[model samples]
Target: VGSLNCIVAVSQNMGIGKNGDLPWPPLRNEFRYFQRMTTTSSVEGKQNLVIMGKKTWFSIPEKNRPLKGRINLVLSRELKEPPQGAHFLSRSLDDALKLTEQPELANKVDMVWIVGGSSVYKEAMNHPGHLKLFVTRIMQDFESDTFFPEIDLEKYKLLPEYPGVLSDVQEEKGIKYKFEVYEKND
Candidate 1:
Protein backbone atom coordinates (compact mmCIF):
# COMPACT_ATOMS: atom_id res chain seq x y z
CA VAL A 1 0.00 0.00 0.00
CA GLY A 2 1.14 3.57 -0.65
CA SER A 3 2.16 5.59 2.39
CA LEU A 4 0.21 8.47 3.87
CA ASN A 5 2.26 11.37 5.19
CA CYS A 6 1.61 14.72 6.88
CA ILE A 7 3.86 17.75 6.61
CA VAL A 8 3.40 20.70 8.96
CA ALA A 9 5.08 23.36 11.02
CA VAL A 10 4.31 24.20 14.63
CA SER A 11 5.53 26.70 17.19
CA GLN A 12 6.50 26.14 20.81
CA ASN A 13 2.86 25.88 21.90
CA MET A 14 2.04 23.72 18.87
CA GLY A 15 0.56 26.77 17.21
CA ILE A 16 0.30 26.48 13.43
CA GLY A 17 -1.65 29.51 12.29
CA LYS A 18 -2.96 32.93 13.15
CA ASN A 19 -6.05 34.33 11.50
CA GLY A 20 -5.98 31.64 8.81
CA ASP A 21 -2.34 32.30 7.91
CA LEU A 22 1.13 31.68 9.27
CA PRO A 23 1.93 33.77 12.29
CA TRP A 24 5.62 33.73 11.51
CA PRO A 25 7.13 35.33 8.48
CA PRO A 26 7.65 33.18 5.38
CA LEU A 27 10.54 30.74 5.53
CA ARG A 28 11.68 30.12 1.98
CA ASN A 29 14.01 27.22 2.75
CA GLU A 30 11.33 25.44 4.72
CA PHE A 31 8.78 26.10 1.99
CA ARG A 32 11.17 24.65 -0.58
CA TYR A 33 11.61 21.55 1.58
CA PHE A 34 7.87 20.99 1.59
CA GLN A 35 7.69 21.52 -2.16
CA ARG A 36 10.52 19.06 -2.76
CA MET A 37 9.08 16.35 -0.55
CA THR A 38 5.60 16.57 -2.03
CA THR A 39 6.65 17.00 -5.66
CA THR A 40 9.36 14.39 -5.96
CA SER A 41 8.27 10.96 -7.23
CA SER A 42 10.54 8.01 -6.56
CA VAL A 43 9.01 6.07 -9.43
CA GLU A 44 8.97 7.38 -12.97
CA GLY A 45 5.72 8.57 -14.59
CA LYS A 46 3.98 9.04 -11.22
CA GLN A 47 3.13 12.07 -9.11
CA ASN A 48 2.23 12.65 -5.44
CA LEU A 49 -1.17 13.78 -4.22
CA VAL A 50 -1.57 16.66 -1.76
CA ILE A 51 -4.80 16.86 0.23
CA MET A 52 -5.69 20.08 2.01
CA GLY A 53 -8.74 21.56 3.71
CA LYS A 54 -10.80 24.13 1.84
CA LYS A 55 -9.57 27.02 3.91
CA THR A 56 -6.02 25.86 3.46
CA TRP A 57 -6.57 25.74 -0.28
CA PHE A 58 -7.87 29.30 -0.30
CA SER A 59 -5.08 30.49 1.94
CA ILE A 60 -2.67 29.85 -0.90
CA PRO A 61 -2.23 32.87 -3.11
CA GLU A 62 -4.51 32.88 -6.17
CA LYS A 63 -1.50 32.92 -8.47
CA ASN A 64 -0.13 29.76 -6.85
CA ARG A 65 -3.38 27.82 -6.49
CA PRO A 66 -2.58 24.40 -7.95
CA LEU A 67 0.81 24.28 -6.16
CA LYS A 68 2.52 23.35 -9.38
CA GLY A 69 3.99 19.84 -9.99
CA ARG A 70 1.76 17.65 -7.83
CA ILE A 71 -1.92 16.74 -8.02
CA ASN A 72 -3.95 18.96 -5.71
CA LEU A 73 -6.96 17.53 -3.86
CA VAL A 74 -9.07 19.89 -1.81
CA LEU A 75 -11.40 18.71 0.96
CA SER A 76 -14.50 20.76 1.46
CA ARG A 77 -18.04 20.16 2.68
CA GLU A 78 -19.44 23.50 1.56
CA LEU A 79 -17.96 23.75 -1.93
CA LYS A 80 -20.08 22.06 -4.60
CA GLU A 81 -17.20 21.69 -7.04
CA PRO A 82 -13.42 21.87 -7.16
CA PRO A 83 -12.50 25.52 -6.79
CA GLN A 84 -10.89 27.35 -9.74
CA GLY A 85 -7.37 25.86 -9.57
CA ALA A 86 -7.70 22.63 -7.58
CA HIS A 87 -7.39 19.35 -9.45
CA PHE A 88 -9.95 17.49 -7.35
CA LEU A 89 -12.46 18.12 -4.59
CA SER A 90 -13.88 15.74 -1.96
CA ARG A 91 -16.45 16.29 0.74
CA SER A 92 -14.38 14.49 3.35
CA LEU A 93 -10.88 13.23 4.02
CA ASP A 94 -12.08 9.64 3.71
CA ASP A 95 -13.50 10.43 0.30
CA ALA A 96 -10.27 12.09 -0.77
CA LEU A 97 -8.31 9.00 0.27
CA LYS A 98 -10.75 6.82 -1.64
CA LEU A 99 -10.23 8.92 -4.77
CA THR A 100 -6.57 7.98 -4.78
CA GLU A 101 -7.48 4.31 -4.51
CA GLN A 102 -9.75 4.36 -7.53
CA PRO A 103 -8.27 2.46 -10.51
CA GLU A 104 -7.92 5.51 -12.75
CA LEU A 105 -5.69 7.32 -10.25
CA ALA A 106 -4.13 4.53 -8.16
CA ASN A 107 -1.34 3.63 -10.53
CA LYS A 108 -0.42 7.26 -11.09
CA VAL A 109 -0.41 8.21 -7.41
CA ASP A 110 2.95 7.66 -5.73
CA MET A 111 2.07 8.93 -2.24
CA VAL A 112 -0.71 10.63 -0.32
CA TRP A 113 0.21 13.73 1.73
CA ILE A 114 -2.11 15.68 3.98
CA VAL A 115 -1.31 19.37 4.11
CA GLY A 116 -3.60 20.65 6.81
CA GLY A 117 -5.49 23.16 8.90
CA SER A 118 -6.30 21.62 12.32
CA SER A 119 -9.23 19.19 11.81
CA VAL A 120 -7.70 17.62 8.72
CA TYR A 121 -4.52 16.79 10.66
CA LYS A 122 -6.57 15.45 13.56
CA GLU A 123 -8.47 13.08 11.31
CA ALA A 124 -5.30 11.87 9.60
CA MET A 125 -3.67 11.20 12.94
CA ASN A 126 -6.59 8.96 13.88
CA HIS A 127 -6.38 6.88 10.71
CA PRO A 128 -5.86 3.10 11.26
CA GLY A 129 -2.99 2.82 8.81
CA HIS A 130 0.57 3.79 9.58
CA LEU A 131 1.62 7.39 8.90
CA LYS A 132 4.76 9.44 8.51
CA LEU A 133 4.91 12.93 9.98
CA PHE A 134 7.26 15.56 8.61
CA VAL A 135 7.24 18.42 11.07
CA THR A 136 9.11 21.70 11.33
CA ARG A 137 9.36 22.79 14.94
CA ILE A 138 9.83 26.52 15.25
CA MET A 139 12.06 27.28 18.19
CA GLN A 140 10.21 30.38 19.34
CA ASP A 141 6.60 30.87 20.31
CA PHE A 142 4.16 32.76 18.10
CA GLU A 143 0.63 34.09 18.33
CA SER A 144 -1.73 31.54 16.75
CA ASP A 145 -5.44 30.87 16.71
CA THR A 146 -4.93 27.39 15.27
CA PHE A 147 -2.79 24.66 16.77
CA PHE A 148 -1.69 21.14 16.00
CA PRO A 149 -2.67 18.26 18.26
CA GLU A 150 -0.23 16.92 20.83
CA ILE A 151 1.52 14.08 19.09
CA ASP A 152 1.13 10.76 20.86
CA LEU A 153 4.74 9.76 21.31
CA GLU A 154 3.50 6.32 22.37
CA LYS A 155 2.18 5.78 18.86
CA TYR A 156 4.70 7.76 16.82
CA LYS A 157 8.47 7.45 17.15
CA LEU A 158 10.84 10.24 16.15
CA LEU A 159 13.76 9.11 14.10
CA PRO A 160 17.29 10.27 14.85
CA GLU A 161 17.62 11.26 11.20
CA TYR A 162 15.70 11.06 7.97
CA PRO A 163 17.28 10.91 4.53
CA GLY A 164 17.19 14.11 2.44
CA VAL A 165 16.02 15.93 5.59
CA LEU A 166 18.15 18.40 7.43
CA SER A 167 18.59 17.44 11.08
CA ASP A 168 20.43 20.55 12.27
CA VAL A 169 18.55 23.63 13.28
CA GLN A 170 18.13 26.34 10.65
CA GLU A 171 17.50 30.03 10.91
CA GLU A 172 15.63 32.19 8.43
CA LYS A 173 14.90 35.88 8.89
CA GLY A 174 16.23 35.26 12.44
CA ILE A 175 13.61 32.58 13.25
CA LYS A 176 15.09 29.25 14.29
CA TYR A 177 13.52 25.87 13.47
CA LYS A 178 14.38 22.23 12.82
CA PHE A 179 12.93 19.49 10.66
CA GLU A 180 11.71 16.29 12.31
CA VAL A 181 10.11 13.12 11.03
CA TYR A 182 7.99 10.82 13.18
CA GLU A 183 7.00 7.35 12.05
CA LYS A 184 3.90 5.65 13.44
CA ASN A 185 4.62 2.27 14.94
CA ASP A 186 2.69 -0.69 13.61
Candidate 2:
Protein backbone atom coordinates (compact mmCIF):
# COMPACT_ATOMS: atom_id res chain seq x y z
CA VAL A 1 0.00 0.00 0.00
CA GLY A 2 1.18 3.50 -0.69
CA SER A 3 1.79 5.86 2.21
CA LEU A 4 -0.01 9.19 2.54
CA ASN A 5 1.82 12.38 3.39
CA CYS A 6 0.63 15.98 3.83
CA ILE A 7 2.93 18.72 2.61
CA VAL A 8 2.38 22.37 3.54
CA ALA A 9 4.02 25.73 4.01
CA VAL A 10 2.82 27.81 6.97
CA SER A 11 3.43 31.18 8.49
CA GLN A 12 4.26 31.81 12.14
CA ASN A 13 0.60 32.43 12.84
CA MET A 14 -0.32 29.31 10.90
CA GLY A 15 -1.71 31.23 7.98
CA ILE A 16 -1.39 29.74 4.50
CA GLY A 17 -2.99 32.26 2.16
CA LYS A 18 -5.37 35.11 1.46
CA ASN A 19 -7.50 36.36 -1.42
CA GLY A 20 -7.03 33.17 -3.47
CA ASP A 21 -3.24 33.28 -3.09
CA LEU A 22 -0.30 33.19 -0.77
CA PRO A 23 -0.20 36.17 1.55
CA TRP A 24 3.56 36.22 1.88
CA PRO A 25 6.26 36.83 -0.67
CA PRO A 26 7.48 33.83 -2.65
CA LEU A 27 10.36 31.77 -1.32
CA ARG A 28 12.26 30.17 -4.20
CA ASN A 29 14.23 27.57 -2.23
CA GLU A 30 11.14 26.53 -0.35
CA PHE A 31 9.27 26.08 -3.60
CA ARG A 32 12.14 23.89 -4.84
CA TYR A 33 11.90 21.81 -1.69
CA PHE A 34 8.17 21.39 -2.32
CA GLN A 35 8.89 20.19 -5.87
CA ARG A 36 11.61 17.81 -4.73
CA MET A 37 9.56 16.18 -2.01
CA THR A 38 6.47 15.72 -4.14
CA THR A 39 8.39 14.39 -7.15
CA THR A 40 10.80 12.02 -5.42
CA SER A 41 10.19 8.33 -4.77
CA SER A 42 12.29 5.41 -3.48
CA VAL A 43 10.99 2.97 -6.06
CA GLU A 44 12.95 3.55 -9.24
CA GLY A 45 10.08 3.06 -11.66
CA LYS A 46 7.38 4.48 -9.42
CA GLN A 47 6.05 8.04 -9.32
CA ASN A 48 4.41 10.07 -6.56
CA LEU A 49 0.71 11.02 -6.67
CA VAL A 50 0.16 14.63 -5.67
CA ILE A 51 -3.42 15.37 -4.55
CA MET A 52 -4.72 18.90 -4.26
CA GLY A 53 -8.08 20.62 -4.01
CA LYS A 54 -9.40 22.40 -7.10
CA LYS A 55 -8.74 25.78 -5.55
CA THR A 56 -5.16 24.87 -4.81
CA TRP A 57 -4.72 23.67 -8.34
CA PHE A 58 -5.97 26.95 -9.68
CA SER A 59 -3.87 28.91 -7.22
CA ILE A 60 -0.78 27.66 -9.02
CA PRO A 61 0.16 29.62 -12.12
CA GLU A 62 -0.68 27.88 -15.39
CA LYS A 63 2.91 27.41 -16.52
CA ASN A 64 3.60 25.09 -13.58
CA ARG A 65 0.27 23.24 -13.67
CA PRO A 66 1.48 19.73 -14.53
CA LEU A 67 4.17 20.05 -11.87
CA LYS A 68 6.69 18.26 -14.08
CA GLY A 69 7.40 14.61 -13.04
CA ARG A 70 4.61 13.81 -10.61
CA ILE A 71 1.11 12.59 -11.30
CA ASN A 72 -1.35 15.34 -10.57
CA LEU A 73 -4.53 14.16 -8.85
CA VAL A 74 -6.92 17.02 -8.39
CA LEU A 75 -10.18 16.98 -6.39
CA SER A 76 -13.13 19.06 -7.50
CA ARG A 77 -16.84 18.60 -7.13
CA GLU A 78 -17.63 21.10 -9.85
CA LEU A 79 -15.25 20.19 -12.62
CA LYS A 80 -16.69 17.92 -15.26
CA GLU A 81 -13.34 16.94 -16.76
CA PRO A 82 -9.74 16.81 -15.70
CA PRO A 83 -8.35 20.29 -16.12
CA GLN A 84 -5.75 20.76 -18.79
CA GLY A 85 -2.40 19.21 -17.76
CA ALA A 86 -3.93 17.30 -14.81
CA HIS A 87 -3.72 13.54 -15.02
CA PHE A 88 -6.84 12.78 -13.02
CA LEU A 89 -9.80 14.34 -11.25
CA SER A 90 -12.16 13.23 -8.47
CA ARG A 91 -15.11 14.62 -6.59
CA SER A 92 -13.70 13.93 -3.17
CA LEU A 93 -10.42 13.09 -1.49
CA ASP A 94 -11.86 9.68 -0.67
CA ASP A 95 -12.37 9.11 -4.37
CA ALA A 96 -8.74 9.99 -5.00
CA LEU A 97 -7.67 7.37 -2.44
CA LYS A 98 -9.55 4.71 -4.36
CA LEU A 99 -7.63 5.54 -7.52
CA THR A 100 -4.41 4.48 -5.85
CA GLU A 101 -5.79 0.95 -5.68
CA GLN A 102 -6.63 0.62 -9.35
CA PRO A 103 -4.48 -2.17 -10.78
CA GLU A 104 -2.95 0.08 -13.38
CA LEU A 105 -1.70 2.46 -10.69
CA ALA A 106 -1.14 -0.02 -7.85
CA ASN A 107 2.51 -0.73 -8.49
CA LYS A 108 3.33 2.48 -10.27
CA VAL A 109 2.77 4.89 -7.41
CA ASP A 110 5.12 5.30 -4.47
CA MET A 111 3.29 7.78 -2.27
CA VAL A 112 -0.01 9.66 -2.11
CA TRP A 113 0.89 13.20 -1.21
CA ILE A 114 -1.80 15.59 -0.01
CA VAL A 115 -0.83 18.99 -1.31
CA GLY A 116 -2.85 21.82 0.18
CA GLY A 117 -5.57 24.33 0.60
CA SER A 118 -7.02 24.42 4.16
CA SER A 119 -10.01 22.12 3.66
CA VAL A 120 -7.98 19.34 2.05
CA TYR A 121 -5.32 19.60 4.71
CA LYS A 122 -8.01 19.19 7.36
CA GLU A 123 -9.21 16.03 5.68
CA ALA A 124 -5.73 14.54 5.32
CA MET A 125 -4.80 15.33 8.89
CA ASN A 126 -7.73 13.22 10.01
CA HIS A 127 -7.29 10.40 7.51
CA PRO A 128 -6.69 6.95 8.97
CA GLY A 129 -3.80 6.23 6.60
CA HIS A 130 -1.99 9.49 7.05
CA LEU A 131 1.66 8.80 7.84
CA LYS A 132 3.75 11.90 7.67
CA LEU A 133 3.58 15.67 7.35
CA PHE A 134 6.20 17.84 5.68
CA VAL A 135 5.96 21.45 6.80
CA THR A 136 7.83 24.52 5.67
CA ARG A 137 7.76 26.85 8.66
CA ILE A 138 7.97 30.47 7.65
CA MET A 139 9.14 32.49 10.64
CA GLN A 140 6.83 35.38 10.02
CA ASP A 141 3.17 36.28 9.73
CA PHE A 142 1.07 37.68 6.95
CA GLU A 143 -2.50 38.89 6.67
CA SER A 144 -4.33 35.84 5.38
CA ASP A 145 -7.71 34.16 5.05
CA THR A 146 -6.44 30.57 4.81
CA PHE A 147 -4.88 28.59 7.61
CA PHE A 148 -3.60 25.09 8.20
CA PRO A 149 -5.53 22.93 10.60
CA GLU A 150 -4.29 22.70 14.15
CA ILE A 151 -1.81 19.88 14.84
CA ASP A 152 -3.27 17.24 17.09
CA LEU A 153 -0.39 16.65 19.48
CA GLU A 154 -2.07 13.60 20.90
CA LYS A 155 -2.04 11.96 17.50
CA TYR A 156 1.11 13.45 16.04
CA LYS A 157 4.62 14.05 17.27
CA LEU A 158 7.04 16.69 16.12
CA LEU A 159 10.39 15.47 14.86
CA PRO A 160 13.62 17.33 15.51
CA GLU A 161 14.24 17.11 11.82
CA TYR A 162 13.27 14.53 9.30
CA PRO A 163 16.12 12.36 8.04
CA GLY A 164 17.64 13.89 4.87
CA VAL A 165 15.81 17.15 5.64
CA LEU A 166 17.88 20.35 5.81
CA SER A 167 17.46 21.53 9.43
CA ASP A 168 19.03 24.93 9.35
CA VAL A 169 17.01 28.09 8.86
CA GLN A 170 17.25 29.41 5.32
CA GLU A 171 16.77 32.89 4.00
CA GLU A 172 15.18 33.55 0.66
CA LYS A 173 14.18 36.85 -0.86
CA GLY A 174 15.01 38.38 2.55
CA ILE A 175 12.69 36.10 4.52
CA LYS A 176 13.68 33.30 6.92
CA TYR A 177 12.25 29.79 7.03
CA LYS A 178 13.04 26.18 8.04
CA PHE A 179 11.79 22.68 7.40
CA GLU A 180 9.73 20.65 9.86
CA VAL A 181 8.23 17.21 9.66
CA TYR A 182 5.70 15.38 11.83
CA GLU A 183 4.78 11.74 12.09
CA LYS A 184 1.60 10.14 13.31
CA ASN A 185 1.88 8.56 16.73
CA ASP A 186 2.15 4.84 16.79
Candidate 3:
Protein backbone atom coordinates (compact mmCIF):
# COMPACT_ATOMS: atom_id res chain seq x y z
CA VAL A 1 0.00 0.00 0.00
CA GLY A 2 1.13 3.56 -0.66
CA SER A 3 2.25 5.40 2.49
CA LEU A 4 0.80 8.65 3.76
CA ASN A 5 2.99 11.71 4.38
CA CYS A 6 2.30 15.15 5.82
CA ILE A 7 4.35 18.15 4.69
CA VAL A 8 4.46 21.56 6.37
CA ALA A 9 6.60 24.48 7.44
CA VAL A 10 6.39 25.82 10.96
CA SER A 11 8.14 28.35 13.13
CA GLN A 12 10.13 27.63 16.31
CA ASN A 13 6.88 27.78 18.25
CA MET A 14 5.23 25.34 15.79
CA GLY A 15 3.15 28.17 14.41
CA ILE A 16 2.00 27.45 10.86
CA GLY A 17 -0.54 30.07 9.80
CA LYS A 18 -1.15 33.72 10.39
CA ASN A 19 -4.36 35.30 9.10
CA GLY A 20 -5.00 32.02 7.24
CA ASP A 21 -1.75 32.27 5.30
CA LEU A 22 1.88 31.30 5.76
CA PRO A 23 3.31 33.42 8.51
CA TRP A 24 6.75 33.79 7.01
CA PRO A 25 7.65 35.50 3.77
CA PRO A 26 8.02 33.44 0.63
CA LEU A 27 10.97 31.07 0.80
CA ARG A 28 11.21 30.07 -2.86
CA ASN A 29 13.88 27.47 -2.32
CA GLU A 30 11.89 25.65 0.37
CA PHE A 31 8.80 25.79 -1.81
CA ARG A 32 10.75 24.24 -4.66
CA TYR A 33 11.59 21.34 -2.37
CA PHE A 34 7.93 20.87 -1.59
CA GLN A 35 6.95 20.98 -5.23
CA ARG A 36 9.56 18.47 -6.19
CA MET A 37 8.64 15.98 -3.49
CA THR A 38 4.93 16.07 -4.08
CA THR A 39 5.12 15.81 -7.86
CA THR A 40 7.65 13.01 -8.21
CA SER A 41 6.77 9.35 -7.85
CA SER A 42 8.62 6.02 -8.03
CA VAL A 43 6.09 4.39 -10.29
CA GLU A 44 6.10 5.43 -13.90
CA GLY A 45 2.98 7.21 -15.23
CA LYS A 46 1.60 7.47 -11.70
CA GLN A 47 1.11 10.70 -9.75
CA ASN A 48 0.97 11.52 -6.06
CA LEU A 49 -2.15 12.69 -4.24
CA VAL A 50 -2.15 15.95 -2.30
CA ILE A 51 -4.91 16.37 0.27
CA MET A 52 -5.60 19.70 1.97
CA GLY A 53 -8.20 21.21 4.25
CA LYS A 54 -10.76 23.60 2.80
CA LYS A 55 -8.95 26.59 4.19
CA THR A 56 -5.64 25.42 2.87
CA TRP A 57 -7.14 24.84 -0.56
CA PHE A 58 -8.45 28.39 -0.70
CA SER A 59 -5.25 29.79 0.75
CA ILE A 60 -3.53 28.94 -2.51
CA PRO A 61 -3.67 31.57 -5.20
CA GLU A 62 -6.48 31.31 -7.72
CA LYS A 63 -4.15 30.92 -10.67
CA ASN A 64 -2.27 28.13 -8.91
CA ARG A 65 -5.27 26.06 -7.95
CA PRO A 66 -5.14 22.21 -8.35
CA LEU A 67 -1.43 22.61 -7.49
CA LYS A 68 -0.50 21.25 -10.92
CA GLY A 69 0.78 17.78 -11.92
CA ARG A 70 -0.94 15.90 -9.08
CA ILE A 71 -4.32 14.87 -7.81
CA ASN A 72 -5.88 17.49 -5.53
CA LEU A 73 -8.30 16.38 -2.84
CA VAL A 74 -9.95 18.94 -0.60
CA LEU A 75 -11.43 18.03 2.78
CA SER A 76 -14.60 19.83 3.74
CA ARG A 77 -17.57 18.30 5.50
CA GLU A 78 -19.90 21.11 4.53
CA LEU A 79 -19.00 21.53 0.89
CA LYS A 80 -21.58 20.08 -1.48
CA GLU A 81 -18.93 19.37 -4.11
CA PRO A 82 -15.22 19.47 -4.60
CA PRO A 83 -13.91 22.96 -5.25
CA GLN A 84 -13.60 23.97 -8.90
CA GLY A 85 -9.98 22.90 -9.24
CA ALA A 86 -10.01 19.93 -6.90
CA HIS A 87 -10.51 16.37 -8.12
CA PHE A 88 -12.25 15.01 -5.02
CA LEU A 89 -13.95 16.10 -1.82
CA SER A 90 -13.35 14.32 1.46
CA ARG A 91 -15.00 14.84 4.81
CA SER A 92 -12.05 13.53 6.79
CA LEU A 93 -8.52 12.20 6.49
CA ASP A 94 -9.81 8.65 6.59
CA ASP A 95 -12.20 9.36 3.75
CA ALA A 96 -9.43 10.80 1.65
CA LEU A 97 -7.21 7.77 2.20
CA LYS A 98 -9.99 5.38 1.34
CA LEU A 99 -10.79 7.25 -1.83
CA THR A 100 -7.25 6.74 -3.08
CA GLU A 101 -7.59 2.98 -2.72
CA GLN A 102 -10.65 2.75 -4.89
CA PRO A 103 -10.46 0.74 -8.14
CA GLU A 104 -10.34 3.79 -10.39
CA LEU A 105 -7.65 5.72 -8.50
CA ALA A 106 -5.65 2.87 -6.99
CA ASN A 107 -3.60 2.34 -10.11
CA LYS A 108 -2.97 6.02 -10.77
CA VAL A 109 -2.12 7.24 -7.28
CA ASP A 110 1.36 6.82 -5.86
CA MET A 111 2.19 8.42 -2.51
CA VAL A 112 -0.42 10.38 -0.56
CA TRP A 113 0.66 13.76 0.84
CA ILE A 114 -1.18 15.83 3.40
CA VAL A 115 -0.79 19.55 2.83
CA GLY A 116 -2.87 21.19 5.46
CA GLY A 117 -4.39 23.65 7.88
CA SER A 118 -3.92 23.05 11.66
CA SER A 119 -6.95 20.81 12.18
CA VAL A 120 -6.11 18.53 9.27
CA TYR A 121 -2.58 18.00 10.54
CA LYS A 122 -3.89 16.98 13.94
CA GLU A 123 -6.26 14.41 12.45
CA ALA A 124 -3.61 13.01 10.10
CA MET A 125 -1.12 12.48 12.92
CA ASN A 126 -3.67 10.74 15.07
CA HIS A 127 -4.51 8.28 12.29
CA PRO A 128 -3.44 4.65 12.74
CA GLY A 129 -1.25 4.31 9.69
CA HIS A 130 2.29 4.70 8.57
CA LEU A 131 2.94 8.45 8.64
CA LYS A 132 6.00 10.41 7.63
CA LEU A 133 6.30 14.10 8.36
CA PHE A 134 8.32 16.39 6.14
CA VAL A 135 8.73 19.47 8.30
CA THR A 136 10.73 22.57 7.49
CA ARG A 137 11.44 24.25 10.78
CA ILE A 138 11.70 28.03 10.61
CA MET A 139 14.54 29.21 12.85
CA GLN A 140 12.74 32.33 14.00
CA ASP A 141 9.28 33.03 15.27
CA PHE A 142 6.41 34.72 13.46
CA GLU A 143 3.14 36.29 14.53
CA SER A 144 0.75 33.41 14.02
CA ASP A 145 -2.75 32.47 15.12
CA THR A 146 -2.69 28.81 14.04
CA PHE A 147 -0.16 26.15 15.08
CA PHE A 148 0.77 22.56 14.33
CA PRO A 149 0.07 20.03 17.02
CA GLU A 150 2.86 18.47 19.05
CA ILE A 151 4.23 15.19 17.75
CA ASP A 152 4.48 12.24 20.08
CA LEU A 153 8.09 11.07 19.82
CA GLU A 154 7.24 7.73 21.35
CA LYS A 155 5.36 6.98 18.16
CA TYR A 156 7.45 8.84 15.62
CA LYS A 157 11.24 9.09 15.27
CA LEU A 158 13.25 11.72 13.48
CA LEU A 159 15.51 10.50 10.73
CA PRO A 160 18.85 11.91 9.66
CA GLU A 161 17.87 11.78 6.01
CA TYR A 162 15.17 10.60 3.67
CA PRO A 163 15.33 9.96 -0.04
CA GLY A 164 15.21 13.14 -2.14
CA VAL A 165 15.27 15.19 1.09
CA LEU A 166 18.11 17.56 1.91
CA SER A 167 19.23 17.29 5.50
CA ASP A 168 21.13 20.58 5.75
CA VAL A 169 19.69 23.73 7.23
CA GLN A 170 18.85 26.16 4.43
CA GLU A 171 18.60 29.93 4.45
CA GLU A 172 16.45 32.15 2.27
CA LYS A 173 15.23 35.72 2.53
CA GLY A 174 17.45 35.89 5.63
CA ILE A 175 15.42 33.13 7.24
CA LYS A 176 17.02 29.87 8.29
CA TYR A 177 15.11 26.60 8.11
CA LYS A 178 15.90 22.90 8.12
CA PHE A 179 14.16 19.96 6.44
CA GLU A 180 13.42 17.00 8.69
CA VAL A 181 11.64 13.67 8.33
CA TYR A 182 9.87 11.83 11.11
CA GLU A 183 8.66 8.28 10.51
CA LYS A 184 6.16 6.48 12.66
CA ASN A 185 7.54 3.68 14.81
CA ASP A 186 6.34 0.16 14.05
Off by over 4 Å in 3: none
Question: Which candidate would rank higher by TM-score, 2 or 3?
Answer: 3
Tens-digit per-residue lDDT, 51-133, candidate 2: 89878888899998988788897888887888898999988888888878888467777888989878888888888845799
Backbone collisions counted per model = 0, 0, 0
Off by over 4 Å in 1: none
Q: Any idea what lDDT model 1 has?
A: 0.87
Model 1 pairs in collision: none
Residue 21 in candidate 3 has what lDDT? 82
Winner on lDDT (2 vs 3):
3
Clashes by residue pair, model 3: none
Summarize candidate 1's per-residue lDDT along 1-186 as a digit string, tens digits.
Answer: 166899998999889988888989989898899899888877867888899998888888889879988889888888788898899888888888887778757877788899997899998987876899899999999999999997888899999999899999999999999999998846
Q: What is the Cα-based TM-score of model 1?
A: 0.96
Local distance difference test, each candidate: 0.87, 0.85, 0.87
